[PDB]
Design a protein around this ligand. Structure first.
Ligand SMILES: [K+]
Length: 262
């Protein structure tokens, strides 16, 4: 147990929930884990895998990201700020990817999942790029039920960190596609209260958040620190009671502890 792990344990104790953290520092490829091999519900952080899978498809179909997808009134779910503008019209797969990632539009995520042949298609992509832990089982919104003990729509912090690194900094995608994914993440709108809130302002972040029942509050980020090689940081958090409140501050606090321990 390291100093950083002891600080994260103290944070967890004061929070009353269960915290999972994985850092990869690409300066030396070293890792810092806290409950790194426990399963957590991904919620909307799973949207990175779906978007990446469609990017991979687009490597052998030049026009794919321009392909129109019909949005019907029945397609709208619980949170769909972009898709609801396009009901009885269309969005392109690029537009759906940006909406899913940057606004966490759930209807957009469901169109990505459909483009991949269902939740199993997203899992198949994960396996193809060497992630044996990720599983997507359901569409939105029910992929966010986040029930304790439920293996559906979960991964581990270690696994997600390794996959996010491969996607954004490694060679799981083609160069253009990797750049596009990083551009999308850097343009996230939802992130400022989470991992980013715990880091120095000068550090550049691209991230995807998630939320669900059981006060589940997630964020996965690729970080470019001032004067340092990039990091990849996963922070997962979930609480015992179904109607617990979000705790984005706990993610910020975890990020701060990680930053101060570099
Ligand atoms: K909630």
């Amino acid at each position: 147990t390291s100093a950083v792990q002891q600080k994260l344990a103290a944070l967890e104790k004061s929070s009353g929930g269960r915290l999972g953290v994985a850092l990869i520092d690409t300066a030396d490829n070293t890792q810092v884990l806290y409950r790194g091999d426990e399963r957590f519900p991904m919620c909307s952080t799973s949207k990175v895998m779906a978007a990446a899978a469609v990017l991979k498809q687009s490597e052998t179909q030049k026009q794919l990201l321009n392909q129109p997808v019909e949005i019907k009134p029945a397609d709208l779910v619980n949170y769909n700020p972009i898709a609801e503008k396009h009901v009885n019209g269309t969005m392109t797969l690029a537009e759906l990817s940006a909406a899913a990632l940057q606004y966490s539009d759930n209807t957009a995520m469901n169109k990505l999942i459909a483009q991949l042949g269902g939740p199993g298609g997203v899992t198949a992509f994960a396996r193809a790029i060497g992630d044996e832990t990720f599983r997507l089982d359901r569409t939105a919104p029910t992929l966010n039920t986040a029930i304790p003990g439920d293996p559906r729509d979960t991964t581990t912090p270690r696994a997600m960190a390794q996959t996010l690194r491969q996607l954004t900094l490694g060679h799981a995608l083609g160069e253009t596609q990797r750049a596009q994914l990083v551009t999308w993440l850097k343009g996230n709108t939802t992130g400022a209260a989470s991992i980013r809130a715990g880091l120095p302002t000068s550090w550049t972040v691209g991230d995807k958040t998630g939320s669900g029942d059981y006060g589940t509050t997630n964020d996965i980020a690729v970080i470019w620190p001032q004067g340092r090689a990039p990091l990849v940081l996963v922070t997962y958090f979930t609480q015992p009671q179904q109607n617990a409140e979000s705790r984005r501050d706990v993610l910020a606090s975890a990020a701060r502890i990680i930053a101060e321990g570099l």
